[PDB]
Design a binder for this molecule. Structure first.
Ligand SMILES: CCCCCCCCCCCCCCCCCC(=O)OC[C@H](CO[C@@H]1O[C@H](CO[C@H]2O[C@H](CO)[C@H](O)[C@H](O)[C@H]2O)[C@H](O)[C@H](O)[C@H]1O)OC(=O)CCCCCCCCCCCCCCCCC
Ligand SMILES: CCCCCCCCCCCCCCCCCC(=O)OC[C@H](CO[C@@H]1O[C@H](CO[C@H]2O[C@H](CO)[C@H](O)[C@H](O)[C@H]2O)[C@H](O)[C@H](O)[C@H]1O)OC(=O)CCCCCCCCCCCCCCCCC
Ligand code: CLA
Ligand code: CLA
Ligand code: CLA
Ligand code: CLA
Ligand code: CLA
Ligand SMILES: CCCCCCCCCCCCCCCCCC(=O)OC[C@H](CO[C@@H]1O[C@H](CO)[C@H](O)[C@H](O)[C@H]1O)OC(=O)CCCCCCCCCCCCCCCCC
Ligand SMILES: CC1=C(/C=C/C(C)=C\C=C/C(C)=C/C=C/C=C(C)/C=C/C=C(C)/C=C/C2=C(C)CCCC2(C)C)C(C)(C)CCC1
Ligand SMILES: CC1=C(\C=C/C(C)=C/C=C/C(C)=C/C=C/C=C(C)/C=C/C=C(C)/C=C/C2=C(C)CCCC2(C)C)C(C)(C)CCC1
Ligand SMILES: CCCCCCCCCCCCO[C@@H]1O[C@H](CO)[C@@H](O[C@H]2O[C@H](CO)[C@@H](O)[C@H](O)[C@H]2O)[C@H](O)[C@H]1O
Ligand SMILES: [Ca+2]
Lengths: 36, 64, 36, 32, 40, 60, 119, 102, 450, 37, 128
């Protein structure tokens, strides 16, 4: 359960970690028009 | 003249040698920071002598 | 009775919050003349 | 009451004190 | 204000006002009058 | 303190004169030349009279 | 400007002085034995409690007593507070003879207030 | 200053009582007022290297960005290694007088 | 001949600013006339608050919200929440009402008589909404001044009188704070706490010295963030992570002001240190503990033993135990078992409410605050009605904790509306389809089938 | 007729004519027969 | 004179002061994809041809001002960029010559009459 808490705490920091440098790598250059 | 991985990261820190600001420069900024520093040295010399003794200082062995 | 010796201005300073609402409605009236 | 009507005087002066800045610009020819 | 601070602060008034400004005005308003000649 | 009627009663009628006369002066470019100065005598009266109600606040 | 406090002191101010005199003779108590032996947060019980009612009580020297000697009697009633700020905030110091000399200051001002103003 | 003498990530310096009896190690608080200028108060030595370090930061952050003037570079002979060495030794002597004193 | 029209700029009479997106001169006149209007409410609401004031009735009963903001800094508050001089509240609003004409003179000069653009005129003031060195200089001009306002409260604190403390011994008092907390383990550590009950991330900030330690560390990084953006550029990743237009800069800020007023809709509902209960009114967590406490000590006078009795339902009627061991007040007060106001902190023993000191150590001041805080619970009508909704409107008190907490939550949620609705137009500003998709090169017909 | 006057001007005085007769009703909840006073 | 037992020079062109909203010296912009080049990667024998050109870009500008005709600027510049396209950066030359122009017209803020003459003549050097 403390054995479980870190396993849930990994997967929140994995998915929010792959949200917070998701937008950081060009995210206004896949907006299908100019500068696509 | 031997290139390393080390020396290709510090040669832009040591690329120039005699690049110099123009005539008489930022001298009096350094002068007024010096005159503030000598006055600061003159204050602390007489804090310690107890000749610019203030209230609640008491430079003495009654301290923390 | 907030003032010290003002004491007749309890009528006038009572309304003084409400005038920023009147600043918005004047911008409709200024726009009602010229622009449409 | 005396200083209730002077309150509502100070209403009725100040409300239409707004649009008399607008009509005086709109009839002298000031650029609105 | 403490009676040994202001007794020190009157020196920084007077050590300025007697030694420094009669050195600075007392040098540059005589050296600028007697300018040296470079044209030989 | 009976002066504190007529000073601030003159302030409330001269600052009511500034809610209306300042967009007229600003509003008209043609008449701006005549009115440009009239704000420095306009607000300059309103400045020193707000200063004068300040000293007469403490004096009474 | 009123000299005669007929019912003004005898009902109010002689009960104003009576409630904090009652905390005073008690006050050589558990509280001194708290700073003798070993009880940190029951001093902060006492400073905001029985000494919380030594001060919120001792507050209306404005509202009952002699308005010419009122502005000299504020800071007499302020120094008793502000020394007792050092009593409750030396409990996070964890060294109970900075608080012990703070408590001896409350001998110098509380009964000096109680010696003063019988009016 | 901050990360060693104040208990944030480190133990404090030695501090005793006057008439030294119960001198042990505890993290001292950096006292910022004039009371930290008398050297018997240890709260100045924690407030030392925070305040001298922050102006040591704002010196070297400034000193990278600018260049010396040519009325100083030919005057102090700043291209030479020896001049710098002389300055350093002179400064060091000044620093050795204070710990001869204090 | 007219700057404003329908067909020269493509904007109607509504969306009634967007002529001013590229026009830089009258945009300054838009804000300074608006900043005169905020100061105009800021003086006159207080100048209406005084002269609708009485000094001997307590502060929260009249339904007034700026006079308790002034009483945090202690402008003539003696001891325990009574006021002694209302003239410090008279000077603060009239230095805003007189200053509103001076702020009003600028926003009417630049919007009418002044220039339309200033890039040519100054070369300092002008911007393109694309020059990335100049746009970060604008933020660096405000951050050095916002740090100067952040050291302005602590310079009121440590020198000029002091800030009011509700944790003063003897009810509440102003005091001059002599050591703000400089240790970052506790105060930057407040940011790393849980945002739920118990921990209370930015809300539970007891020992007022931690607040005045905050604006040390707020303004000393706002100065340090101020002088960064003067000297340097944004970074290379920051150039490609943001939208760089006249729009989005409002929407980056509108996302922040929506976030800031959610925090403002929790500082005034839960916190009892930055917002004192004797000026603003008691909280919902305060008044429900104040409900059970006066019925506890009412019982003490009667003499029934508190511990032995089992409520109507098996639990203790007065003193049961919380899930983590603190002996707390019983009934429906188990939700506010984290209550840490200034009264009943002399009932907090080692575990919690200790029964050695819960008997024989209730004070007559201690109950009469909770007697006042019971009936002054945050329970309003729309109009003036107070107390339970079912209850008749005998007396009126809206408790301006509650009456200001919902008012920001109107504006906190509405600023999340427009931030989201500007982020659509700002992202379509650089993408070029703010006016809709094209006729010919529709991008979805180029997309493959499903 | 040729006596036409700008509508916008009479848009104000009809609008504040509407505003004072609904502003009088919210005065009337606070004194009178329904006010519980 | 080699030596280096006291002297070495250079630099100057930095962050002194000024508040002025006057003297619009046609602002210079950087072309995109430009980075300032380091001397150590470039080469000392490669840059000694480079730095004498920067004096030579204005030495012929001073020649053309007293010549009264910008023909000598506009004939010794055509295709210089496609000569030096291999060695020098084409993007570094435009940003150097623009701020060479803008700093030169800042020196002509006092006369108020020849500043618009050299603004016509430096713009021949930029546009060619
Ligand atoms: C289709 C049709 C629909 C539209 C029809 C037209 C309606 C237009 C919109 C409504 C406009 C309101 C009319 C104004 C009359 C009024 O309301 O008048 C009421 C008051 C003024 O009345 C006074 O209101 C007082 C209110 O009590 C206050 O004072 C009392 C006595 O001291 C108590 O102390 C109490 O604590 C305190 O609250 C008393 O009732 C006084 O007797 C009375 O004179 O107007 C005020 O002040 C208002 C305050 C001004 C700014 C508003 C700020 C609101 C911030 C909170 C918003 C959050 C969301 C709320 C949800 C709703
Ligand atoms: C991410 C999403 C955050 C919101 C999710 C729900 C979190 C619970 C919550 O909302 O809770 C809000 C919390 C604070 O929670 C309250 O914080 C309180 C701190 O007060 C303490 O200190 C006070 C001092 O005045 C009083 O003494 C009070 O009695 C004492 O308990 C207690 O911990 C309470 O149990 C608790 O309800 O965070 C705050 O302030 C800020 C909350 C930010 C989000 C706001 C959304 C509305
Ligand atoms: C990781 C590095 C490291 C660490 C943590 C230590 C740690 C320590 N060393 Mg040590 N040491 C190191 C590297 C290190 N050493 C190296 C590399 C050398 C060789 C130079 C030494 C040589 C050495 C000696 C000879 C001694 C120590 C000693 C000590 C101990 C006490 C230090 C003391 O009294 O401070 C005294 C330090 C100072 C007074 C600092 C001098 C700096 C002056 C005051 C300022 C100079 C001007 C400034 C730079 C310019 C202005 C800056 C301004 C702008 C802010 C301490 C345990 C003592 C010991 O015996 O422990 C076993 C001791 O006598 N050290
Ligand atoms: C800091 C705040 C801020 C700022 C400066 C702006 C700035 C701007 N907004 Mg905007 N907006 C914001 C917040 C902000 N927004 C928020 C939070 C919302 C959500 C509510 C909106 C919703 C909004 C809309 C809905 C749109 C804009 C648009 C615009 C642009 C044109 C403005 C215009 O023509 O006004 C027009 C002003 C009006 C039509 C007046 C409306 C009056 C409302 C309905 C009154 C509401 C009741 C009010 C509280 C009074 C009640 C009185 C009571 C007695 C009943 C301009 C750049 C437009 C745009 O895209 O242009 C770029 C656009 O179409 N805004
Ligand atoms: C906070 C409110 C606010 C503010 C400060 C502004 C400000 C501005 N708007 Mg605006 N606007 C607003 C709300 C606001 N608006 C709302 C809610 C709407 C929707 C109805 C609009 C719709 C709108 C449109 C459609 C346009 C503007 C434009 C403008 C700008 C120039 C106005 C002009 O040239 O006419 C000057 C006005 C007059 C000459 C008329 C006289 C009215 C006077 C000046 C009112 C102030 C008097 C005051 C009481 C006296 C002060 C006292 C003194 C002592 C300080 C100006 C910056 C225009 C623009 O972009 O600029 C070209 C434009 O086209 N606005
Ligand atoms: C956000 C506020 C703001 C900003 C950015 C500007 C910006 C500008 N104004 Mg301006 N102005 C403002 C508010 C503002 N104004 C207000 C409120 C008024 C009414 C009093 C004016 C009245 C005004 C006039 C009458 C004129 C300008 C002009 C100008 C432009 C030229 C700048 C110049 O030469 O100044 C030079 C700067 C100074 C001489 C320094 C003065 C600094 C102040 C007064 C000292 C006090 C500082 C204060 C203590 C700081 C703390 C602030 C605190 C009180 C909140 C410039 C774009 C001119 C213009 O449009 O060009 C034709 C012009 O003629 N302004
Ligand atoms: C409110 C004032 C303010 C504003 C508007 C800006 C604005 C800006 N700063 Mg800045 N700055 C400020 C104050 C401010 N700064 C202060 C006070 C400092 C001193 C500490 C700095 C130090 C500074 C540097 C050192 C840098 C910037 C940078 C930037 C730029 C991009 C910001 C960015 O991408 O980071 C946004 C942050 C992230 C993308 C990281 C994620 C942050 C968290 C994890 C997201 C989740 C937060 C969560 C919702 C809330 C929980 C809080 C906490 C418990 C985690 C932008 C122009 C950058 C730049 O362009 O250089 C100039 C940059 O490198 N600033
Ligand atoms: C000019 C042209 C006008 C055209 C109008 C055509 C008819 C429209 C009829 C619709 C309104 C019906 C409700 C009347 C309101 C009323 O009588 O208030 C009259 C009431 C009565 O006021 C009461 O008078 C009593 C006298 O003893 C007491 O003193 C009370 O205290 C006092 O409140 O005042 C109010 O309610 C104030 C609020 C008014 C706002 C009500 C809005 C209702 C909207 C409902 C939705 C309908 C759609 C409308 C918009 C389209
Ligand atoms: C400080 C002061 C003062 C000043 C004041 C002011 C600031 C004024 C201004 C004012 C104003 C500025 C006002 C305004 C008003 C407005 C109005 C009055 C408007 C409107 C109304 C209405 C009702 C509307 C309507 C409508 C609508 C709804 C929309 C559409 C259109 C129409 C029109 C229909 C004085 C000295 C005097 C006094 C003392 C204090
Ligand atoms: C004294 C004080 C205090 C202390 C301290 C402080 C003052 C702190 C601050 C702190 C801080 C300083 C915080 C911060 C925060 C931050 C934020 C809130 C941010 C946000 C942002 C975002 C969220 C975004 C992101 C992103 C995305 C998502 C996408 C793109 C990219 C990016 C990254 C941009 C307290 C509280 C106790 C109280 C009182 C005052
Ligand atoms: C921008 C740099 C900031 C400059 C200001 C630095 C302030 C000083 C930093 C140390 C703060 C206080 O220092 C220490 O704090 C910790 C926090 O657990 C306490 O423990 C210590 O008793 C106290 O000495
Ligand atoms: Ca009034």
């Amino acid at each position: 359960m403390v054995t479980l808490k870190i396993i849930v705490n990994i997967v929140v920091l994995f998915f929010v970690g792959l949200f917070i440098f998701g937008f950081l790598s060009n995210d206004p250059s896949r907006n299908p028009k100019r500068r696509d | 003249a031997q290139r390393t991985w080390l020396g290709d990261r510090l040669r832009p820190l040591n690329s120039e040698y005699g690049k110099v600001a123009p005539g008489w420069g930022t001298t009096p900024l350094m002068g007024v920071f010096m005159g503030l520093f000598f006055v600061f040295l003159l204050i602390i010399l007489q804090i310690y002598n107890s000749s610019l003794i203030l209230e609640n200082v008491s430079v003495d062995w009654a301290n923390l | 009775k907030l003032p010290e010796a003002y004491s007749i201005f309890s009528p006038v300073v009572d309304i003084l919050p409400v005038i920023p609402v009147f600043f918005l409605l004047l911008a409709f009236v200024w726009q009602a003349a010229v622009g449409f | 009451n005396f200083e209730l009507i002077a309150q509502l005087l100070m209403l009725s002066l100040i409300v239409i004190a707004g649009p008399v800045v607008i009509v005086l610009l709109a009839f002298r020819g000031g650029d609105l | 204000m403490t009676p040994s601070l202001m007794n020190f602060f009157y020196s920084l008034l007077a050590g300025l006002l007697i030694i420094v400004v009669p050195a600075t005005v007392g040098l540059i308003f005589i050296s600028q009058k007697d300018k040296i000649i470079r044209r030989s | 303190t009976l002066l504190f009627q007529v000073l601030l009663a003159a302030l409330v009628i001269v600052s009511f004169l500034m809610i209306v006369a300042v967009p007229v002066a600003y509003a008209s470019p043609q008449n701006w030349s005549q009115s440009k100065p009239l704000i420095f005598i306009g607000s300059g009266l309103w400045a020193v009279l707000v200063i004068l109600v300040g000293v007469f606040n403490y004096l009474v | 400007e009123p000299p005669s406090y007929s019912s003004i002191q005898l009902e109010k101010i002689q009960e104003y002085k009576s409630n904090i005199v009652a905390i005073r003779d008690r006050s050589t108590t558990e509280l001194v034995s708290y700073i003798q032996k070993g009880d940190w947060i029951n001093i902060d019980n006492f400073a905001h409690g029985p000494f919380g009612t030594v001060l919120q009580e001792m507050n209306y020297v404005v509202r009952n007593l002699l308005p010419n000697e009122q502005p000299e009697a504020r800071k007499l009633s302020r120094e008793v507070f502000e020394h007792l700020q050092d009593m409750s905030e030396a409990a996070a110091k964890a060294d109970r003879q900075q608080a012990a000399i703070s408590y001896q200051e409350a001998l110098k001002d509380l009964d000096l207030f109680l010696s003063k103003f019988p009016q | 200053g901050a990360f060693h003498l104040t208990g944030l990530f480190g133990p404090g310096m030695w501090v005793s009582d006057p008439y030294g009896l119960t001198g042990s190690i505890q993290p001292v608080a950096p006292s910022w007022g004039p009371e930290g200028f008398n050297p018997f108060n240890a709260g100045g030595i924690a407030a030392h290297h925070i305040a001298a370090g922050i102006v040591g930061i704002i010196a070297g952050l400034f000193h990278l960005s600018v260049r010396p003037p040519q009325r100083l570079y030919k005057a102090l002979r700043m291209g030479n290694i020896e001049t710098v060495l002389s300055s350093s030794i002179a400064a060091v002597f000044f620093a050795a007088f204070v710990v001869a004193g204090t | 001949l007219g700057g404003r029209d329908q067909e020269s700029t493509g904007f109607a009479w509504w969306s009634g600013n967007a002529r001013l997106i590229n026009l830089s001169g009258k945009l300054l006149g838009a804000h300074v006339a608006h900043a005169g209007l905020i100061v105009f409410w800021a003086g006159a609401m207080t100048l209406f608050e005084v002269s609708h004031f009485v000094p001997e009735k307590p502060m929260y009963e009249q339904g007034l919200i700026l006079l308790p903001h002034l009483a945090t800094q202690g402008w003539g508050v003696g001891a325990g929440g009574e006021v002694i001089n209302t003239f410090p509240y008279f000077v603060v609003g009239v230095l805003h009402l007189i200053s509103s004409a001076v702020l009003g003179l600028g926003g009417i000069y630049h919007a009418v008589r002044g220039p339309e653009v200033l890039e040519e005129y100054s070369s300092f003031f002008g911007y393109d909404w694309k020059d990335k060195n100049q746009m970060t200089n604008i933020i660096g001009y405000h951050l050095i001044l916002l740090g100067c306002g952040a050291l302005l409260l602590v310079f009121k604190a440590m020198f000029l009188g002091g800030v009011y403390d509700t944790w003063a011994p003897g009810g509440g008092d102003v005091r001059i704070i002599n050591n703000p907390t400089l240790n970052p383990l506790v105060i930057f550590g407040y940011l790393l706490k849980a945002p739920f009950g118990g921990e209370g991330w930015m809300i539970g900030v007891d020992n007022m010295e931690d607040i005045i330690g905050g604006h040390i560390w707020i303004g000393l990084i706002c100065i340090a963030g101020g002088v960064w953006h003067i000297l340097t550029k944004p970074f290379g990743w920051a150039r490609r992570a943001f939208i760089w237009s006249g729009e989005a800069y409002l929407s980056y800020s509108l996302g922040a002001l929506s976030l800031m007023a959610f925090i403002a809709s929790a500082f005034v509902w839960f916190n009892n240190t930055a917002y004192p209960s004797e000026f603003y009114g008691p909280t919902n967590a305060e008044a429900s503990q104040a409900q059970s406490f006066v019925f506890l000590v009412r019982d003490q006078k009667l003499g029934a033993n508190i511990g032995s009795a089992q409520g109507p339902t098996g639990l203790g009627k007065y003193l049961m135990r919380s899930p983590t061991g603190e002996i707390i007040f019983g009934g429906e007060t188990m939700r506010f078992w984290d209550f840490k106001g200034p009264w009943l902190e002399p009932l907090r023993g080692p575990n919690g409410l200790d029964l050695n000191k819960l008997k024989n150590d209730i004070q007559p001041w201690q109950v009469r605050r909770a007697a006042e805080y019971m009936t002054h619970a945050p329970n309003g009508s729309i109009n003036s009605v107070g107390g339970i909704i079912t209850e008749a409107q005998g007396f009126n008190y809206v408790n301006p904790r509650a009456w200001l907490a919902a008012s920001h939550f109107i504006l906190a949620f509405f600023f999340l509306i427009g931030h989201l609705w500007h982020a659509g137009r700002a992202r379509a500003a650089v993408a070029g389809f703010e006016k809709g998709i094209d006729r010919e090169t529709e991008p979805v017909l180029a997309m493959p089938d499903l | 007729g040729d006596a036409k006057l700008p509508l916008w001007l009479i848009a104000t005085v009809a609008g504040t004519g509407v505003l004072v007769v609904v502003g009088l009703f919210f005065y009337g909840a606070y004194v009178g027969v329904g006010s519980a006073l | 004179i080699s030596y280096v037992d006291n002297r070495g020079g250079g630099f100057f062109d930095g962050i002194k002061s000024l508040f002025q909203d006057s003297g619009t010296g046609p602002a210079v912009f950087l072309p995109p994809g430009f980075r300032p080049i380091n001397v150590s990667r470039y080469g000392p024998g490669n840059m000694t041809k480079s730095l004498r050109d920067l004096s030579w870009f204005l030495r012929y500008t001073t020649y053309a001002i007293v010549a009264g005709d910008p023909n000598i600027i506009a004939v010794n510049v055509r295709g210089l960029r496609e000569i030096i396209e291999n060695a020098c950066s084409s993007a570094a030359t435009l940003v150097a010559l623009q701020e060479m122009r803008r700093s030169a017209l800042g020196y002509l803020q006092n006369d108020k009459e020849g500043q618009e003459i050299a603004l016509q003549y430096f713009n021949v050097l930029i546009s060619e």
